[PDB]
């Protein structure tokens, strides 16, 4: 339940390890998906199956009014759940997580597009 | 005119719910994008004529002045694999 | 009307967590940014479509 560099039996990778509900056959050591990428592993000492999640990543995108108008900016961590951002105002979206933008209940017309129905603007 | 229209709408409803292939032009676009993403990830298993396809297993066997030459192969072959995907995506995106 | 927006971090594709491969890939110059400009240009035009 933390991001770590793992090395089980030379199968080096980096991700979040967590308990799997998969059961391997007694002899199988690694688990792969349709992409032929390792997504599960059985620990070689305490024989149990661990799911590997690729630990979180995404584009930073900066939302701004024009330079002349203002300097203030809001930041989008695309595809990131912001339980992971402070490690480096807040509002989670399906597009990723905004910081510095204020969330409002009123539906204005879309000025700067963000994603998943969300847009941003500069306002009082 | 109403009874003909109300029947024709009923035939659309049944047809879409009955046959597999009617959504073909959309399912094809989902399948081409899945196939291209799958192909792009599979290219990471390819050696490109280097000693290995696993970057850490190159670094764990050769010293730096020649481990760089193997890593340069994988960089060249993987960069060629992204360029093939992005060219496919651009040409497709022009179709869409 | 559209297709799935996709995006790549070129460094995680080519060089996933190897700083050596990352410092070698840097020799090739703008190639990864040119790929991201291309893919983000496909991504925005899905909304335009």
């Amino acid at each position: 339940n933390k991001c770590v560099n793992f090395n089980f039996n030379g199968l080096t990778g980096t991700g979040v390890l967590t308990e799997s509900n998969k059961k391997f056959l007694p002899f199988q050591q690694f688990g792969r998906d349709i992409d032929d990428t390792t997504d599960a592993v059985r620990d070689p000492q305490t024989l149990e199956i661990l799911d590997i999640t690729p630990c979180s990543f995404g584009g930073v995108s900066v939302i701004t009014p024009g330079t002349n108008t203002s300097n203030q900016v809001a930041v989008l961590y695309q595809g990131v759940n912001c339980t992971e951002v402070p490690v480096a105002n807040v509002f989670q979206t399906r597009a990723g997580c905004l910081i510095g933008a204020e969330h409002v209940n009123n539906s204005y017309e879309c000025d700067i597009p963000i994603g998943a129905g969300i847009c941003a603007s500069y306002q009082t | 005119i109403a009874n003909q229209f109300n029947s024709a709408i009923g035939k659309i409803q049944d047809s879409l719910s009955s046959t597999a292939s009617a959504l073909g032009k959309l399912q094809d676009v989902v399948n081409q994008n899945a196939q291209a993403l799958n192909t792009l990830v599979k290219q990471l298993s390819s050696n490109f004529g280097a000693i290995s396809s696993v970057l850490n297993d190159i670094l764990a066997r050769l010293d730096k002045v020649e481990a760089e030459v193997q890593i340069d192969r994988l960089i060249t072959g993987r960069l060629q694999s992204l360029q093939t995907y992005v060219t496919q995506q651009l040409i497709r995106a022009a179709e869409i | 009307v559209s297709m799935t927006k996709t995006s790549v971090d070129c460094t995680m594709y080519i060089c996933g967590d190897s700083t050596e491969c990352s410092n070698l890939l840097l020799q090739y110059g703008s190639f990864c940014t040119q790929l991201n400009r291309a893919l983000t240009g496909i991504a925005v035009e899905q909304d335009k479509n």
Partner: peptide
Amino acid sequence: VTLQKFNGLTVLPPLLTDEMIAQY
């Protein structure tokens, strides 16, 4: 129509949700 990965690959959501496309 029958329809975040390891190697730097991601999918991004559309600016309009399938609710907003339904509403238009």
